[PDB]
Amino acid sequence: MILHAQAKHGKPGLPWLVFLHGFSGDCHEWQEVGEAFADYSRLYVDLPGHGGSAAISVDGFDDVTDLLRKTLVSYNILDFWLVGYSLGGRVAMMAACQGLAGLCGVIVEGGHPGLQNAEQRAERQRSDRQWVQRFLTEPLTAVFADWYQQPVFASLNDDQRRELVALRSNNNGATLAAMLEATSLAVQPDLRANLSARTFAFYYLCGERDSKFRALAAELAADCHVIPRAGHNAHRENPAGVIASLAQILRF
């Protein structure tokens, strides 16, 4: 078993760009940005519980990393960057730190490096448990209307929220719930020390208007690219700015 993905072949010999969406996303998330890198090969992955990988269940990050490894092998990917947004950024950091053969660098957009005490982990465990129950029992248009009013999405306007609710409501609430619990920030290690000692290149992207993750990026041993006029999902709101940042990172 491998993850569902969409592959696009670029110039032979250039690295693959392996894109990981965020929670409730799917393999289309990064395509507006990724297809700008037409000379690279692109792998747009559906994480467990998401898109065409809905039926793939995992118990935690070890299982996700293993699935990612198998997927890369299946596509004959030998030399690649991992590019992850939010949950996908956390998956990317976990997989990179656990070890992926052929990884040359990681680019994380708004991915949390980990909580730092038991109180915070308990709070997140409880909060994620409440969302899990909502995803199991409520109309997804109602759940996502509240999802996109969380603080990390405060910066959005009403039009943006309406569009996102409509988009994300194409999803399986049960498999979203299973994945939300399995890869909850509550169960993630604090990766700051590991990221500091990294063998792989590590870059951070953050929307200008994403106050939480601008502060987090400052705690990290990475070059941080602040994306103008963008919130947490900076590549969605300012794709041209994210393409420019990715070009600076990749082509140097």
Ligand SMILES: O=C(O)CCC(=O)C1=CC=C[C@@H](O)[C@@H]1C(=O)O
């Ligand atoms: O874009 C979205 O709707 C969600 C982005 C996303 O992956 C996350 C948002 C907020 C909390 C988490 O569940 C998750 C994350 O881990 O970043």
